[PDB]
């Protein structure tokens, strides 16, 4: 049911398997239900996990969808992670 995504600084983020599989890249890494991200720090990976919860909730819902917030200080590294994980 859950998987563990570990940031470059050792923070362990635990999310549902279904959320984690929205990334094709993570699905590939998972086939321990753990994945180590040696280049994605904690302030990027936590935002990634927030996006999973946001994507799953607001895909197919028509209730008015809110902006996904990205602080300017986080955008460059979030872009690099999103680009690498294809999401």
């Amino acid at each position: 049911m859950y998987v563990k995504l570990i940031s470059s600084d050792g923070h362990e983020f635990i999310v549902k398997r279904e959320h984690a599989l929205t990334s094709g890249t993570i699905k590939a890494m998972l086939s321990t239900n753990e994945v180590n991200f040696r280049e994605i720090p904690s302030h990027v990976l936590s935002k990634v996990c927030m996006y999973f919860t946001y994507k799953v909730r607001y895909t197919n819902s028509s209730t008015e969808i809110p902006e996904f917030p990205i602080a300017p200080e986080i955008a460059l590294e979030l872009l690099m992670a999103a680009n690498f994980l294809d999401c």
């Binding site: 549902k16 927030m50 946001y54 300017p72 986080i74």
Partner: protein, 102 residues
């Protein structure tokens, strides 16, 4: 009504959701399924405030408006090993200086 949470202790962070009507104890049962630790060996906090088992997440102020999916509410987690550790949550890494451009 769904509330969206980060249950956080040390360098552990659980992303899960629950109902406003569900109870702190039921939240602890969810922690049990993941970290394999019984409720009586867990204390849950909203900030520094110790949360009582019978209270609903809504009464503890975890509401649809403040525990959103893109912006989850933090719930502190503390274990006991015959004494309970203090509540400790290690912060996330800090972003680098904003580049001259942004």
């Amino acid at each position: 009504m769904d509330v969206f949470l980060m249950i956080r202790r040390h360098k552990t962070t659980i992303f899960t959701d629950a109902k406003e009507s569900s109870t702190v104890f039921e939240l602890k049962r969810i922690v049990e399924g993941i970290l394999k630790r019984p409720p009586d060996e867990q204390r849950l906090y909203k900030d520094d405030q110790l949360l009582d088992d019978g209270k609903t997440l809504g009464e503890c102020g975890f509401t649809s408006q403040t525990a959103r999916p893109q912006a989850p509410a933090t719930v502190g987690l503390a274990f006991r090993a015959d004494t309970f550790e203090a509540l400790c949550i290690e912060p996330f890494s800090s972003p680098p200086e904003l580049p001259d451009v942004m």
